[PDB]
Design a protein around this nucleic acid. Structure first.
Length: 164
DNA sequence: CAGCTGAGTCGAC
DNA sequence: CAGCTGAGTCGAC
DNA sequence: CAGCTGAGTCGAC
């Protein structure tokens, strides 16, 4: 995992929570993500200050993580629309900011396999606990990403090249 | 974003 | 007007 | 396939 550990060096980690499976599947297919404006501003500021910003995805009530990815841009408004399945009470403009993301792993990891990992930045609660945008301490987030099964469909050349 | 809440005075120093 | 924020899991019942 | 069943809330954290 030396290439994987390289991508994770000095990274900041954020839990991303989706209300539906459809938007995570579209995120994996198109390499983009959108979030509410508060978390959008948080991720934009993290992108500018951190070597890498890693998003760890978990569909609400699914009992698993669905993979993780690296932010490759700040959010962009006004591009070609992403046709998200809009959660209840949310409009398309609320998710108007579109981040480009490079997926590092698109495989699943059940919460049962992460039960030994606690986040010291969230009162040492298990890493499965949190709302959208919950930040995860460096070492806890690194170990979590290393728990995912290997994704043979991922080529880390491009993400590593744009980090040089 | 978009719907929501709340918007002190008075006196010592 | 400025300030705030929702796309948490889990046990009890 | 194709006929069938079932579609928790609330509060601590």
């Amino acid at each position: 995992t030396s290439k994987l550990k390289y991508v994770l060096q000095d990274a900041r980690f954020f839990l991303i929570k989706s209300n539906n499976h459809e938007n995570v599947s579209l995120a994996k297919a198109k390499g983009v993500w959108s979030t509410l404006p508060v978390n959008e501003k948080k991720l934009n500021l993290a992108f500018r200050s951190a070597r890498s910003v890693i998003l760890i995805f978990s569909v609400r009530e699914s009992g698993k993580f669905q993979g993780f990815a690296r932010l490759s841009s700040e959010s962009h408004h006004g591009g070609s629309p992403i046709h998200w399945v809009l959660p209840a009470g949310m409009s398309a403009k609320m998710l108007g900011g579109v981040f480009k993301i490079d997926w590092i792993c698109r495989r699943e990891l059940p919460f049962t396999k992460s039960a030994h990992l606690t986040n010291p930045w969230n009162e040492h609660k298990p890493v499965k606990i949190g709302r959208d945008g919950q930040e995860i301490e460096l070492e806890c987030g690194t170990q979590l990403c290393l728990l995912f099964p290997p994704d043979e469909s991922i080529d880390l050349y491009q993400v590593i090249h744009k980090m040089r």
